[PDB]
mmCIF file with all atom_site columns, C-alpha atoms (C1' of nucleotides) in Angstrom:
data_model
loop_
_atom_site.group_PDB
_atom_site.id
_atom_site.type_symbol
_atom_site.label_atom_id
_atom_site.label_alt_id
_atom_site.label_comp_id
_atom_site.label_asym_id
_atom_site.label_entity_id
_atom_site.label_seq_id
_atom_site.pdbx_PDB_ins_code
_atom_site.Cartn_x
_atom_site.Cartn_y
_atom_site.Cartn_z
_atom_site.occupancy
_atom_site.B_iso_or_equiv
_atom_site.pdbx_formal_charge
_atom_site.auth_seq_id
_atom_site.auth_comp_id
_atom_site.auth_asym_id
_atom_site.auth_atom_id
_atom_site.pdbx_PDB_model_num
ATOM 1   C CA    . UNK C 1 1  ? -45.137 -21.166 -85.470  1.00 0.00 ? 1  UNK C CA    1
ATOM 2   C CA    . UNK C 1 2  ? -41.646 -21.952 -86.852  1.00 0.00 ? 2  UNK C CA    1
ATOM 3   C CA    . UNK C 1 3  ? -38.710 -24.237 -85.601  1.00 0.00 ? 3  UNK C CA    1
ATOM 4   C CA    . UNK C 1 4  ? -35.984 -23.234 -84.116  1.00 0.00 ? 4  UNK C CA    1
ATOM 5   C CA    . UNK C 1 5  ? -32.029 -23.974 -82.754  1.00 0.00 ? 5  UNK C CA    1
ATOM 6   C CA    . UNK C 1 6  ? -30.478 -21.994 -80.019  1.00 0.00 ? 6  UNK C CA    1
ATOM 7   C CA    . UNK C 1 7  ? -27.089 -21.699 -79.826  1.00 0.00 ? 7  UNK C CA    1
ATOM 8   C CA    . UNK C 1 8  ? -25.371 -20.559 -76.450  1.00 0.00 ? 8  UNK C CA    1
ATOM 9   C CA    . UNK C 1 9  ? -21.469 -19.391 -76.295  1.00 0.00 ? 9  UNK C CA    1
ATOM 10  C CA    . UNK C 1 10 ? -20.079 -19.280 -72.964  1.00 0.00 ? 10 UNK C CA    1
ATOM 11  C CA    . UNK C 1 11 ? -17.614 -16.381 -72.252  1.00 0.00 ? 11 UNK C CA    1
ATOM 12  C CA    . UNK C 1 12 ? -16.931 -18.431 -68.938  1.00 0.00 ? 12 UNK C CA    1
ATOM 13  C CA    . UNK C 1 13 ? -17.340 -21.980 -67.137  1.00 0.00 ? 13 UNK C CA    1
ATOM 14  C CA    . UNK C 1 14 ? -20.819 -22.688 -66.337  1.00 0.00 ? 14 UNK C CA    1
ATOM 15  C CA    . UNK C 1 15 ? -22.150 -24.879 -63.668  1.00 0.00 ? 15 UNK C CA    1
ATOM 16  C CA    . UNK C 1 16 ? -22.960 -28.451 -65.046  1.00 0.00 ? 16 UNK C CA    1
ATOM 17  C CA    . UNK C 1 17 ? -26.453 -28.737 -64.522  1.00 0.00 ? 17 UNK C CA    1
ATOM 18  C CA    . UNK C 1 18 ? -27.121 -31.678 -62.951  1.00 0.00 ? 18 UNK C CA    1
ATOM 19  C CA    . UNK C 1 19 ? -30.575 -32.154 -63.965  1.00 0.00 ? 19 UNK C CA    1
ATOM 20  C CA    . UNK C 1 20 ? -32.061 -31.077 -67.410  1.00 0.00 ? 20 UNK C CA    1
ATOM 21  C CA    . UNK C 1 21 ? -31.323 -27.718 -68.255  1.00 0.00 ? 21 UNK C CA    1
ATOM 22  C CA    . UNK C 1 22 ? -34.510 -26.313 -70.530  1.00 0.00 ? 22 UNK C CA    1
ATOM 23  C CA    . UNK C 1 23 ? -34.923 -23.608 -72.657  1.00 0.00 ? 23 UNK C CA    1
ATOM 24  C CA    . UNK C 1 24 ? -38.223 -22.668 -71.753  1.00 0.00 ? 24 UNK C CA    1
ATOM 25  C CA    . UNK C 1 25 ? -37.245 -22.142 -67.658  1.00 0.00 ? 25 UNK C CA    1
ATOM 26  C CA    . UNK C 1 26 ? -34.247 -19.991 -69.138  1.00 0.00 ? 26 UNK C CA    1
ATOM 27  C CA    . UNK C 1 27 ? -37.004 -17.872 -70.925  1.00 0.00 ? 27 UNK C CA    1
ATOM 28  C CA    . UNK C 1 28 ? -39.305 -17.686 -68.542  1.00 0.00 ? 28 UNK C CA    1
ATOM 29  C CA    . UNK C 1 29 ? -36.258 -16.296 -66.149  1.00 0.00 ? 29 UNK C CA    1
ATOM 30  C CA    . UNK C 1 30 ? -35.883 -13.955 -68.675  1.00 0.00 ? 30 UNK C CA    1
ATOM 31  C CA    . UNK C 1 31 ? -39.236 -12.738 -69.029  1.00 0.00 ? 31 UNK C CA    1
ATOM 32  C CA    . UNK C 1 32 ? -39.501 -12.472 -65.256  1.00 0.00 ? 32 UNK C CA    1
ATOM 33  C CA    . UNK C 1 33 ? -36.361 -10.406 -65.447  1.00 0.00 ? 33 UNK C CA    1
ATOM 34  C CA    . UNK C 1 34 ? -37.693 -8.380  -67.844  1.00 0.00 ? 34 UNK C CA    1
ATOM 35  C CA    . UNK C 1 35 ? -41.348 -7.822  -65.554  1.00 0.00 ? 35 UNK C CA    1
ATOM 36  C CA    . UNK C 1 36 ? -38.999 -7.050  -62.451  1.00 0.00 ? 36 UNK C CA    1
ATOM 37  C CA    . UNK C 1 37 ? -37.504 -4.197  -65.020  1.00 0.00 ? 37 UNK C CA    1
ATOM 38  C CA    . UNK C 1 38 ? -40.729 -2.634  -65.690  1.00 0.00 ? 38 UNK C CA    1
ATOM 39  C CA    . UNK C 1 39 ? -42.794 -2.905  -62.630  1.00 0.00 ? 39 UNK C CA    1
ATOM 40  C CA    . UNK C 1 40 ? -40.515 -3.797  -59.686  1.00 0.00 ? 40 UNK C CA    1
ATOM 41  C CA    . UNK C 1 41 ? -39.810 -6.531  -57.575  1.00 0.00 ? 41 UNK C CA    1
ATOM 42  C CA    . UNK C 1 42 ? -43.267 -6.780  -55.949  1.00 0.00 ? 42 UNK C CA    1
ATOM 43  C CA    . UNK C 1 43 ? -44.749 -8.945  -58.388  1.00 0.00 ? 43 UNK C CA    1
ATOM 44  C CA    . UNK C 1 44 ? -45.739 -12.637 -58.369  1.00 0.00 ? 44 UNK C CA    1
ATOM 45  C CA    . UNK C 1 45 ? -42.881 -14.467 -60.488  1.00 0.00 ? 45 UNK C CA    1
ATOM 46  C CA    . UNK C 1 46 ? -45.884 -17.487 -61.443  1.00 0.00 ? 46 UNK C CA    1
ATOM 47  C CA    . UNK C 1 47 ? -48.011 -14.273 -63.122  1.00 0.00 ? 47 UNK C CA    1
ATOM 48  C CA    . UNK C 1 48 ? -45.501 -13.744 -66.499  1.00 0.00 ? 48 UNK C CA    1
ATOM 49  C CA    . UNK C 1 49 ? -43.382 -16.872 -66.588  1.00 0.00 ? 49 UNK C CA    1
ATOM 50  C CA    . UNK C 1 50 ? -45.426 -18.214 -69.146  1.00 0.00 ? 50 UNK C CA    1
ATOM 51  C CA    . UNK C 1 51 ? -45.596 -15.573 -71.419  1.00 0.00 ? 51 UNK C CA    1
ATOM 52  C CA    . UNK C 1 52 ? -42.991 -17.111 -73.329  1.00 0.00 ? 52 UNK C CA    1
ATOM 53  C CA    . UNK C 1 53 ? -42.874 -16.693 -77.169  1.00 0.00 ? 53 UNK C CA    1
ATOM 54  C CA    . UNK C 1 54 ? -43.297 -20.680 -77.447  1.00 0.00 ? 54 UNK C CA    1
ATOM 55  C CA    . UNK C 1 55 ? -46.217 -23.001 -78.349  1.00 0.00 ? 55 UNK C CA    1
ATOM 56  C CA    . UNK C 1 56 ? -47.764 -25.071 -76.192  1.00 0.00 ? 56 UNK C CA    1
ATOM 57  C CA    . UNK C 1 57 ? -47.984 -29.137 -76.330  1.00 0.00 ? 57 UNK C CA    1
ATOM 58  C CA    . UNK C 1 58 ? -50.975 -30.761 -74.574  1.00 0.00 ? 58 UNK C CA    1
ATOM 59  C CA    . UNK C 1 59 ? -51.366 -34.584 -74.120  1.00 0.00 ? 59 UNK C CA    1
ATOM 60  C CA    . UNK C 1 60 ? -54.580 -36.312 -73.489  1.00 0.00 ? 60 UNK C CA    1
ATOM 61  C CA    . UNK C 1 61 ? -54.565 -35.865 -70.043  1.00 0.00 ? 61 UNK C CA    1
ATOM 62  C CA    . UNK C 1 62 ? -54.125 -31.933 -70.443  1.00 0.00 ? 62 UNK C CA    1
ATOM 63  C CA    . UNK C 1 63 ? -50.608 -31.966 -68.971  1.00 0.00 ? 63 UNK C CA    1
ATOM 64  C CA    . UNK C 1 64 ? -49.034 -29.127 -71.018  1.00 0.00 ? 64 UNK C CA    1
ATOM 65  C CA    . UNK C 1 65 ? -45.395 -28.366 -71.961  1.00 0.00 ? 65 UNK C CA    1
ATOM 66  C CA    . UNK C 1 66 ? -43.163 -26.038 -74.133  1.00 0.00 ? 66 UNK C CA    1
ATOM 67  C CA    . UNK C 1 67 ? -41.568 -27.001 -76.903  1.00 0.00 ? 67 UNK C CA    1
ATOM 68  C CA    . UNK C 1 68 ? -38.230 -26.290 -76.011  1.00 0.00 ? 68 UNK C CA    1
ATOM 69  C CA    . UNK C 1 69 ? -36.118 -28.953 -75.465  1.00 0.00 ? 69 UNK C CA    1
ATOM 70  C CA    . UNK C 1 70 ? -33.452 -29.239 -72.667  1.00 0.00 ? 70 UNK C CA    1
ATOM 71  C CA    . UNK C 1 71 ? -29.895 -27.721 -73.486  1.00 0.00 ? 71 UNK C CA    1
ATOM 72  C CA    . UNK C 1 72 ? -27.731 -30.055 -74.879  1.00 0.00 ? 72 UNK C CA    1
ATOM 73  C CA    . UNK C 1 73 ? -24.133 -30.006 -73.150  1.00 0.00 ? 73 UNK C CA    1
ATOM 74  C CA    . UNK C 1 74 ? -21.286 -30.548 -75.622  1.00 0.00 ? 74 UNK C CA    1
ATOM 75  C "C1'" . G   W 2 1  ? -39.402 -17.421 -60.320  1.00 0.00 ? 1  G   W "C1'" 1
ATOM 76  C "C1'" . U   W 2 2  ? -32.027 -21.029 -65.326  1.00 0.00 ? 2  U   W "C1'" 1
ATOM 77  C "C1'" . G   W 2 3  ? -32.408 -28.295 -59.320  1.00 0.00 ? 3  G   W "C1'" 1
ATOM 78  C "C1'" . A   W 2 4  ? -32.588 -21.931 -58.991  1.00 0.00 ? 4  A   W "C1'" 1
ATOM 79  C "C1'" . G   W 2 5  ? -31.736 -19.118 -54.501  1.00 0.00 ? 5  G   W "C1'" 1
ATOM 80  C "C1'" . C   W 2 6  ? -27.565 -18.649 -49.702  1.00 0.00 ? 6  C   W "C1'" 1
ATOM 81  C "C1'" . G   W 2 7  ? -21.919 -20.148 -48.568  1.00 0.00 ? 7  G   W "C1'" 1
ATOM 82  C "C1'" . G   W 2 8  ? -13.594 -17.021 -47.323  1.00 0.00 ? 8  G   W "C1'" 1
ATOM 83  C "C1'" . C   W 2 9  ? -9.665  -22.950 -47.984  1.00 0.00 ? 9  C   W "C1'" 1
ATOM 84  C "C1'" . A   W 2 10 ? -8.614  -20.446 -43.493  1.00 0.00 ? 10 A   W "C1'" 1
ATOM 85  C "C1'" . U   W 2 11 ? -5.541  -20.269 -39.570  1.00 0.00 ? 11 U   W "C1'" 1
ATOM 86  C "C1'" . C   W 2 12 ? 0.366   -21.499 -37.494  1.00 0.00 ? 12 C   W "C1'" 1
ATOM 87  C "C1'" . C   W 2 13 ? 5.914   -22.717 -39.328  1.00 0.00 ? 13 C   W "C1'" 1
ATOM 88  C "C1'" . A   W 2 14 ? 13.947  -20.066 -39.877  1.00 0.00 ? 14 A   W "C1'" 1
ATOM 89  C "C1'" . A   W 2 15 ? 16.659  -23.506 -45.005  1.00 0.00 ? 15 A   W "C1'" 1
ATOM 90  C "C1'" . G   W 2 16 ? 20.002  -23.326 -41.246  1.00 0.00 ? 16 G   W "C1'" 1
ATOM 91  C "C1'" . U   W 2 17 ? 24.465  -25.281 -39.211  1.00 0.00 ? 17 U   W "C1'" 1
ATOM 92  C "C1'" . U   W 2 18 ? 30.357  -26.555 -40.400  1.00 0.00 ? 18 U   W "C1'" 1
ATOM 93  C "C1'" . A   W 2 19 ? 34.740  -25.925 -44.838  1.00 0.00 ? 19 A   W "C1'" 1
ATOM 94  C "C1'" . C   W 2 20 ? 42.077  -22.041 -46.462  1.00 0.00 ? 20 C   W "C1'" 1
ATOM 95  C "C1'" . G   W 2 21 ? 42.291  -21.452 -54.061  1.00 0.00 ? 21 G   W "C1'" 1
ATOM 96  C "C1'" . C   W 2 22 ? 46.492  -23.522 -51.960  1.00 0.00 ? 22 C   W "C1'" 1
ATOM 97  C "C1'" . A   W 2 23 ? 51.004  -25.657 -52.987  1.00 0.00 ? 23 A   W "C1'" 1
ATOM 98  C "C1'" . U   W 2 24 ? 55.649  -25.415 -57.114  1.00 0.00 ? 24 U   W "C1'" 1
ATOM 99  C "C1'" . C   W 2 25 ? 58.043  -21.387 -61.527  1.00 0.00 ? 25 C   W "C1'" 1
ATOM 100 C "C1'" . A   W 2 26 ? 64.906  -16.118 -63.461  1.00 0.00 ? 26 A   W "C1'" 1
ATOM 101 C "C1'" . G   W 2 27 ? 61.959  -11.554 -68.787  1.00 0.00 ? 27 G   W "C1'" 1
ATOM 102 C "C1'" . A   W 2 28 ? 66.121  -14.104 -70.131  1.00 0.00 ? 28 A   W "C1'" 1
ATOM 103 C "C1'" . U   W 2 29 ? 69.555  -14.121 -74.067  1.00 0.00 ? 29 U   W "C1'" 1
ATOM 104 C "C1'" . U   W 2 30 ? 72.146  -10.048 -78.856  1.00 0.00 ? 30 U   W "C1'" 1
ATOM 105 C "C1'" . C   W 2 31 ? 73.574  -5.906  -80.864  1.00 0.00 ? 31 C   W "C1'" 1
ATOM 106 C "C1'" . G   W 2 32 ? 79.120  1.509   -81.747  1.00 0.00 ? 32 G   W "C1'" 1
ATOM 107 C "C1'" . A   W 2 33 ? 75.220  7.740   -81.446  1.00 0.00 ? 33 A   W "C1'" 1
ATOM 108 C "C1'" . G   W 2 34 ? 78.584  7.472   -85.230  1.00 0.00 ? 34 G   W "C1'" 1
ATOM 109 C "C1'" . A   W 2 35 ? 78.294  8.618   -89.921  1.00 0.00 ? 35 A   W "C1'" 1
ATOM 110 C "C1'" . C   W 2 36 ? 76.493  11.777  -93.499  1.00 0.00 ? 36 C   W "C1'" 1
ATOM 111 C "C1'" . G   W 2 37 ? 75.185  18.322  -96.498  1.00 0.00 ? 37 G   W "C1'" 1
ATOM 112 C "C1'" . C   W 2 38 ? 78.549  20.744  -103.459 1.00 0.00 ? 38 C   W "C1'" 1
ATOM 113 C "C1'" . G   W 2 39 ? 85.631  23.364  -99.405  1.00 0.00 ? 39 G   W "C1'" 1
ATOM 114 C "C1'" . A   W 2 40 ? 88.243  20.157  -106.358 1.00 0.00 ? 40 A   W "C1'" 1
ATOM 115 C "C1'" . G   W 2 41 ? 85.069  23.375  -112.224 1.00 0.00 ? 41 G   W "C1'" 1
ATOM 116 C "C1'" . U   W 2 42 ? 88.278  27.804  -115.435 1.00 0.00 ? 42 U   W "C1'" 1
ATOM 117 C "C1'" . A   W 2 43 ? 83.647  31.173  -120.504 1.00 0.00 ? 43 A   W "C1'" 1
ATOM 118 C "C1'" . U   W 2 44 ? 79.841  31.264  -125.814 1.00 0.00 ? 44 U   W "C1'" 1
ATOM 119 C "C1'" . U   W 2 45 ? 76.503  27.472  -128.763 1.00 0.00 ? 45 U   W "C1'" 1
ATOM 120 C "C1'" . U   W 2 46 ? 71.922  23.693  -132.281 1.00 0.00 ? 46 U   W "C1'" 1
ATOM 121 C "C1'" . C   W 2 47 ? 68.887  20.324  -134.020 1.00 0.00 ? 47 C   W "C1'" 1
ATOM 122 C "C1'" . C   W 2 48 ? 64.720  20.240  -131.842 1.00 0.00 ? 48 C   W "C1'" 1
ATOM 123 C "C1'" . C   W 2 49 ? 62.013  21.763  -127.510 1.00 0.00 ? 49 C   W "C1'" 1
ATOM 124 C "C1'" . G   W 2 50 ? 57.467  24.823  -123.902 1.00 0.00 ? 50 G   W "C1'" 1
ATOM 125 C "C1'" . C   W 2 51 ? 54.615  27.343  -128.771 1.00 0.00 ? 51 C   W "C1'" 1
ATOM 126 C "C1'" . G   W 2 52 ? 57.047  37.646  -130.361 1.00 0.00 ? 52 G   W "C1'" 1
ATOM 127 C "C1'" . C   W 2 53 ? 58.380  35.494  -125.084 1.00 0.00 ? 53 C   W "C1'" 1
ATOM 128 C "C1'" . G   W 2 54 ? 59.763  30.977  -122.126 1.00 0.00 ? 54 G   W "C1'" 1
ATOM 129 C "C1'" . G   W 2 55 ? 65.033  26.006  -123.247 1.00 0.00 ? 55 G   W "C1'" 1
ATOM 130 C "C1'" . G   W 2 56 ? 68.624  21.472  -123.370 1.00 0.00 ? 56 G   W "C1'" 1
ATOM 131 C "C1'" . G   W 2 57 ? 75.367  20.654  -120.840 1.00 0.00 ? 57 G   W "C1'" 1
#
RNA sequence: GUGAGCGGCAUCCAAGUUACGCAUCAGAUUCGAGACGCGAGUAUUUCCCGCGCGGGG
């Protein structure tokens, strides 16, 4: 619905990831974070992880990802 | 539900033992407390001065 860059400054050393780092997992934390907020820590983390405010891409096989691409580490 | 979540670098240990700031050097030569303080002068006048008054023997 538009395209976007996400810039990230760290305040402190992270922990080098040492597998992709994505932008949509970090949102869906996020989101769950937000979820825990309102209703508690008795909910199902796999029922609002995906209500992430990214579109969708589906191959032919219907295997589905977000577009958000993996951090970049400079 | 951020290859996420969980996770003490921690325990013990002597910088200590011996060693001389010591030996040798003139504060010396030169010069007065003795000199100094109106005790001697032998009486009426002018050009100018501070300006009627104050002044130059």
């Amino acid at each position: 619905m538009d395209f976007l860059k996400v810039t990230i400054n760290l305040g402190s050393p992270m922990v080098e990831p040492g597998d992709l780092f994505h932008l949509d997992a970090l949102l869906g934390a996020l989101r769950v974070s937000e979820v825990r907020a309102e209703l508690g820590d008795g909910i199902n983390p796999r029922d609002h992880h995906y209500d992430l405010p990214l579109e969708q891409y589906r191959s032919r096989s219907g295997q589905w990802v977000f577009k958000a691409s993996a951090f970049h580490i400079n």
